[PDB]
Amino acid sequence: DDVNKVHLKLEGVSSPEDIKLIQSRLESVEGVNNVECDTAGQTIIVAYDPDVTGPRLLIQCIQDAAQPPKYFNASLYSPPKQREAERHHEIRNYRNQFLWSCLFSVPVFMFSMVLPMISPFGDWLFYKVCNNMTIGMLLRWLLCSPVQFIIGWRFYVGAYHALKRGYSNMDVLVALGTNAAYFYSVYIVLKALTSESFEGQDFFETSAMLISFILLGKYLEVVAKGKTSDALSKLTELAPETACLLTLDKDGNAISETEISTQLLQRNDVIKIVPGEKVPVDGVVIKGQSHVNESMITGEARPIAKKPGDKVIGGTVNDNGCIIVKVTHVGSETALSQIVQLVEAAQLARAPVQKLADRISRFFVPTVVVAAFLTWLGWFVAGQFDIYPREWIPKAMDSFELALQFGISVLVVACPCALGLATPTAVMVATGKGASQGVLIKGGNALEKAHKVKAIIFDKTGTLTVGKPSVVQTKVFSKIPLLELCDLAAGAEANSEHPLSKAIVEYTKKLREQYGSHSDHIMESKDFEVHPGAGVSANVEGKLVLVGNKRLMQEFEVPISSEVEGHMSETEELARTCVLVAIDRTICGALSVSDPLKPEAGRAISYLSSMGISSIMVTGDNWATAKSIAKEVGIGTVFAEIDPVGKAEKIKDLQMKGLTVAMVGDGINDSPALAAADVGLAIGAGTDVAIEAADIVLMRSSLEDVITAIDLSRKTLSRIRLNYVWALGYNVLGMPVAAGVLFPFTGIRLPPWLAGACMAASSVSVVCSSLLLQLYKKPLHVE
C-alpha cells in the first residue's frame, strides 16, 4: 500500500517520535486531501495523490526528514513478489510438518518391524512391567500419540467441514482409517495390561507410516504449485526494479542520470536508457533511438527505425545507443500483472474433469466404509457360531480378533487418493510447463475443449502475411513520369489512407530510384475521390498514378481493355494479384498486390495433417486469390469475400454438424467469431483483450506453438486417463484380497501393518506419475 493511506515505520522507528519524523515531511508536502485527522492515531488515514506528487516526492521526504540513528532508507510496505514470500512460507510450513512427522514415524516402524528380530534389544522390549503388556507397546503408544493428535490435525479439521455440509472427501476416509487403527491398538494394549493370560499384538506402524506419506503427497502438490507460480512469475516480470532518472523537462537540460525505482519516474520524468538497462516501464518516449529486440521506438541495430517520439515504450535489453523517455504511465498497469490474477482465477476455477473427480468421490467413500463394515459382520457371526475350521485362526488370537483385523484392513487399502492428488496437480503442472513456452492455458476447461478438436479456422491477415510491395506487387508496366514517385512525386494515391493505402504509399518509399527527391508538386486531394476497394486518386503524377477501383476506372477513362485482364490472370496465377489503376487517365500501366507468407506454414499444415485434423482458412478477397493461396498451402475447403460475420455463420455450421473447431488470429475484430468458436487460441499475443473473447492465448508469433498447445493438451488428457485406469485397477483388486477371498482357499491375508503399505505405495507412485509431465518437449524441434 503506502499510496492513499500511507503508513510506514522503517528502520530506527520505535516510538511515535520517529513516526512523526516521517509524518511531518510526508503528509505536509503537497499531494494530500487530508481525509479527517486522527490526532496522532498511529495509522492516520488521510487522502494522498500517489499519481503525480507521489512515490519520488513522498519517499525522498521520508529520507530528508530523517536525522540518522539509522537514516530511514525507503522500506515501503510493498509485495516482494508476495507470491514468492507466500509460497516460501507455505513450503516451509509443509516441509517442516512432514519433517517433524518422519521424526516419530521412522522410529516406530523400526522398533516393531526390524528391531524385534535382533537381540538383546528386543529382549529389553520384552521385559514385562505389568501383566503381559511390555516396554515395546508402552514406548510405541507414547511415540505414536503425537503423530495423530498434534501433527495430524487437518485430518479432522477438514473432515468436519465436509461432514457438517453433508458430503465427504479424501480426508474423511484417511481420518477414519488412522483413527480406527489407533483405537484398536489402544484396545489391544488394555487387554494385555489387565490380564497376563493374553498376549495380543499391536498396530501403530500403519498409523505412523500412512500419515507420513500422505503429508509427503500434500507437500509434493504444493511444491508443484510453487514451481508453476514461479514459472509464471519469471515471465511476468521482464523488467528491472529501478530505472535511471535523467531529469529534464521534455527535451533538453539533462540534469543528471540517477538510479531509482520504476514508479518514481512517471509524469514527464525521464529515463535515459543506457546500453544494458532493460526497458522497465511505459509512457511516451519523445527522444532517443534504440532498435532493441522489441516493438517500441528504434535505432540501435535491428532495423525497425522509429524516429524519436512514438506511443509504445516497453522492451528488452539494449544495444549501442540510448533513448530519452517522457513517461506518462509506467509499465505497471501492463497486462502481465493481471494475467497473473486471471490465471490464478482459472486455477481457482476448474474443469468438468475436475468436477468429474468430485462426483465419483461423492459416491465412493460411502461405499468403502459400508463394505468394510459388512466384511466385519461376515467373519464375526460365522466365527461366533463356528461355521468354519478353527485351524485357520493363527495362534495368539481368536475369531473376534480376525473379524476386527479384516475390518481394519479394508478401511486402510482404499483409493490411493488419486482422485484429489493426481488430477488437481496434473492440471496445474500442465499450465506451468506451457507457460515456460510463453503459451498460457486458461484453466482446465480450456485444456479439455482444446483436447477435443479436429478442425482449425485460419485466415491470411496477420497470421500468414509479411508484405513486400514492388513491381511484383505494386507498380506499372508502362512508362511513368516522376519515377520512382514517392517524396514529392506521387501524391496521386495519398488521399484516403487505410491498411492498404498506406502500403500503396510505402512501396513508393521502397522504390525511389537512386536520386533523393525529384521534388515536383504533390497535389494531394485535388479531385479527391474515394471508392471502396481503392479509394485513393486525385490528380498528381506518376504518369498520373491515381489508382482506383471498379467505379473509378471507367469513371476517369479507363476502359479496362483486354490487356488488364491478361495482366490480371497472369498476376493472380503468380499470386501477385493486380489492383486496378488509372495511369494517365488510361488503361496503360497496371498495379499489383501480393503477399509473402511466414516460412513455416507448410511445416505446420503438413504436421497438422499428420495428427489428422482439418485445416480451413477464409479470406475477404476474391475467390481466385484464395484458391491460389490454397494451391500454395495445400488446404481443404476455402472461403473468400468473407467478413467476420460470415466467419460466424461458417463456425456455427461447422459446430452444428458436430465438429469442435478452433480458429487462429488476434485481430480484435475477430471477437464475434472468436467467441463463436469452440475455443480461443489467438496467434500473436496482444493483451487481456484477447482473453476477453478467447480461452487459449498464444504468446509468440510463430505458427509452430499452435502445434505445441494442442499436443500438450492431448498429452495431459492421456496422462490423466491413464492415472484413472491405474486407480481403478489397483482398487478393484485391493478391496477383495484385503477383505479376504484368498485366505479361505490359500490362507494369505494382509496384516494392517503391510496392508497400509500398498495404500502408501500407490499414493506416491500416482503423484510421481503425474509429476513426470514436466519433462515434456517440443514435437517439432524447429521443423
Per-chain topology:
Elements (H helix, E strand, L loop, with lengths): L15 H11 L28 H11 L16 H32 L7 H5 L2 E3 L2 E2 H17 L2 H12 L4 H25 L10 H33 L4 E2 L16 E2 L10 E2 L13 E3 L32 E3 L11 H13 L3 H11 L2 H20 L14 H13 L11 H13 L8 H8 L3 E5 L41 H10 L42 H4 L5 H12 L27 H11 L2 E5 L4 H11 L4 E2 L4 H13 L4 E3 L7 H6 L11 H6 L10 H36 L3 H4 L5 H20 L12
Parallel strand pairs: 8-9, 8-11, 9-10
Antiparallel strand pairs: 1-2, 3-4, 5-7, 6-7
Task: Count every helix, treating DSSP H or I runs of 4 or more residues as helices.
Answer: 25
- Distance N to C terminus: 49 Å
Oligomerization state of this entry?
A: monomer
The CATH top-level class label of the domain at 467-594: Alpha Beta
Task: Sketch the major β-sheet.
Answer: 4 strands, parallel
CATH topology of the domain at 467-594: Calcium-transporting ATPase, cytoplasmic domain N
Q: What is the number of strand segments?
A: 11
Instruction: Indicate the structural class.
Output: mainly alpha
Beta strand %: under 5%
CATH architecture of the domain at 467-594: 3-Layer(aba) Sandwich
Based on CA atoms alone, the radius of gyration comes out at: 37 Å
- What percent of the residues sit in helical stretches (DSSP H or I)? 40-55%
The largest sheet has its strands arranged as: 10-9-8-11
CATH superfamily of the domain at 467-594: Calcium-transporting ATPase, cytoplasmic domain N
Please tell me what the overall shape is: flat
